[PDB]
Amino acid sequence: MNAPPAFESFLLFEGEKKITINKDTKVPNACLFTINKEDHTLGNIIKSQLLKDPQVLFAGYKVPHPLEHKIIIRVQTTPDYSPQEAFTNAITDLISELSLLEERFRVAIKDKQEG
């Protein structure tokens, strides 16, 4: 009667975009990234990778409502840096981490199966 399809949590509706960037006028050099059809899986890793950047002053995320399927990521950086640049570098670092982890897991399987 009122059950949303299970694909709604991860599929995107037409005309609604994956990520939206919004100044935060609160404080300088802060942005809100509203990411649609993602959840804690990406929000947590992006936030923690951003917390590794010493030029990031604030990094946080929230799922505003569990029944809704978007996350907000707030990023504040130092004035010489940009929250968009910080977000990009965090994603790049996560990708490189996962590529390295994948290659090393392949090697570890390789070794386990043959010795």
Binding site: P54, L57, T78
Partner: protein
């Protein structure tokens, strides 16, 4: 300088009323140079303190070695010379009370400054001479270092 008070204290007792909180302990200490009593709540989990320990306590209005006010906002990406570098345990709080033995006609010979570091309470009481730097509703730092 920005230093309201500086002295060397000796831990005389820890939790006389018993352990109330697991990661926080109350030290009852007394100095030697000024004869000031101190009650201090410290996070013993990260900065353990044993009975009989001796430490230097510095109540300061600012961390910057040059006279410069603080904004009360957390700025980890700050490169100026901070006096927190010289110390091990640093807390930031506000003075919420100043008692004294004053009468309706006489001024206070002994004062008692109460500070709150985010709920960790301190009472520094002794001669009013040494507690002129304290106003109520004023932000201060702890700057405590253990010495042998």
């Amino acid at each position: 300088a920005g230093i309201l008070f500086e002295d060397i204290f000796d831990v005389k007792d820890i939790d006389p009323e018993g352990k109330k909180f697991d990661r926080v302990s109350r030290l009852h200490c007394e100095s030697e140079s000024f004869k000031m009593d101190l009650i201090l709540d410290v996070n013993i989990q990260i900065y353990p303190v044993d009975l009989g320990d001796k430490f230097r306590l510095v109540i300061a209005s600012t961390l910057y070695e040059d006279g410069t006010l603080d904004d009360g906002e957390y700025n980890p990406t700050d490169d100026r010379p901070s006096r927190a570098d010289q110390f091990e345990y640093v807390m930031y709080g506000k003075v919420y009370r100043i008692e004294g033995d004053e009468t309706s006609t006489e001024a206070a010979t002994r004062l008692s400054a109460y500070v709150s570091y985010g709920g960790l309470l301190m009472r520094l009481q002794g001669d009013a001479n040494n507690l002129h730097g304290f106003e109520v509703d004023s932000r201060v730092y702890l700057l405590m270092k253990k010495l042998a």
